[PDB]
Structure 1
Amino acid sequence: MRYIHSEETIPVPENLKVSIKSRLVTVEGPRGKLQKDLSHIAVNFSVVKKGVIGLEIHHGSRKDVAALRTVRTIINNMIIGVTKGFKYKMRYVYAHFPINVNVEKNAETGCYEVEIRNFIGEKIVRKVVMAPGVEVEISKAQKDELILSGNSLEAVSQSAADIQQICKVRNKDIRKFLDGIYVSEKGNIVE
């Protein structure tokens, strides 16, 4: 079973610009610019209407057509991200031993780095380098919050996963020792 024609459309708001060349997408708007390369997928791009982009695959199989929506949702996420940004929230959870962190400022480059001390009462100092373009803040709204913000969802989420994955308990029952840092809510910078 080979499918003749499968098509979807993406609207574009009247605020930003997008240009595609040789399967390389450039999106630039009020909050910056992003680049992505999609040369590994055979897709045909076209301009359906004044503000609608269409893309399609011809004579594809079910497995090939399955990947068609993935680019659509990635491009939509980039469109949202370049006009509204992204924001993740994190909480610290300890029972007895407090954990203290220090998100020091730029280290002579755009990258931020986070220092974590006193995890389950350990004297190890553990060092993490954030992806470029992501801003880390200690919240002042109320206590025990870590604020992550940025332009790209992939970098914001991966950096959050780095923070989550670096605080691990070893040789203990993790159903009893619930210590660690976890993400609790994801959203946009505006509203």
Structure 2
Amino acid sequence: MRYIHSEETIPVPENLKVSIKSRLVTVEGPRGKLQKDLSHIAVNFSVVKKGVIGLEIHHGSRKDVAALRTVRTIINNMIIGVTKGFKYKMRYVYAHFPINVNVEKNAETGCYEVEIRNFIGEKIVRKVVMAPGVEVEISKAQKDELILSGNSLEAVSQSAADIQQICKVRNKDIRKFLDGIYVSEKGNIVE
């Protein structure tokens, strides 16, 4: 049983522009530019009205129709991201050994790199390198807070995960040893 027509729509605010060509989406607004390549999905793009994007699939199956709503939210995130940015927060949690962090901006490579020292009183020094376009900051309103921000949600979230996954405990109870860097709230920059 194959459905004969599955259609979805996307509204665009009149503050930016979008161009599609050979499944190469380009969104440009008051905060930069983003690109994606959807060549792996068979979808037909079209313009329904003066401010509405449309995308459809014909004679698709169940496994194939599932992918339409996925595409919609990916393109929506690009539109909202360019006009409102994204911003993640992370908190330190320790019992005895304090955690020290250093943030130094690399020059000629652009991107930032973080430095975690004294984790659970450890003698090693562990380094992580952020993705291009994300900016790391140390908070000044609350104590022991990190703030990650940028334009592309996928990079921002993936960079936060790198920090969280690097700090792990080994050969202990993870029910009692609750040390590590964790994420505490996700949202946007504007509003």
TM-score, normalised with respect to structure 2: 0.99
C-alpha deviations, 1:54-101, integer Å up to 9, x for none?
000000001000011111000000100000000000000000110101
Aligned counterparts of 1:29 and 1:106: Cα–Cα separation in 2:
27
Aligned counterparts of 2:107 and 2:113: Cα–Cα separation in 1:
8
Bigger mean CA deviation after superposition, 107-116 or 8-17: 107-116
Aligned counterparts of 1:175 and 1:141: Cα–Cα separation in 2:
30
Measure how far apart 1:103 and its partner are: 1.0
TM-align CA RMSD:
0.6
Q: Secondary structure at the match of 2:111?
A: coil
Unaligned ranges ≥5, structure 2: none
Measure how far apart 1:51 and its partner are: 0.2
Q: Secondary structure at the match of 2:4?
A: strand
Unaligned ranges ≥5, structure 1: none
Q: Secondary structure at the match of 1:60?
A: coil
Aligned counterparts of 1:84 and 1:109: Cα–Cα separation in 2:
26
Q: What count of residue pairs does the alignment treat as equivalent? A: 191
Aligned counterparts of 2:122 and 2:97: Cα–Cα separation in 1:
9
**Runs (4+) of structure 1 moved beyond 4 Å?**
none
1:13-92 matches, within 5 Å, as 13-92=13-92
Measure how far apart 1:144 and its partner are: 1.1
Q: Secondary structure at the match of 2:59?
A: strand
Bigger mean CA deviation after superposition, 105-114 or 13-22: 105-114
TM-score, normalised with respect to structure 1: 0.99
Measure how far apart 1:108 and its partner are: 2.4
Measure how far apart 1:107 and its partner are: 3.4
Aligned counterparts of 2:4 and 2:146: Cα–Cα separation in 1:
49
Aligned counterparts of 1:135 and 1:123: Cα–Cα separation in 2:
27
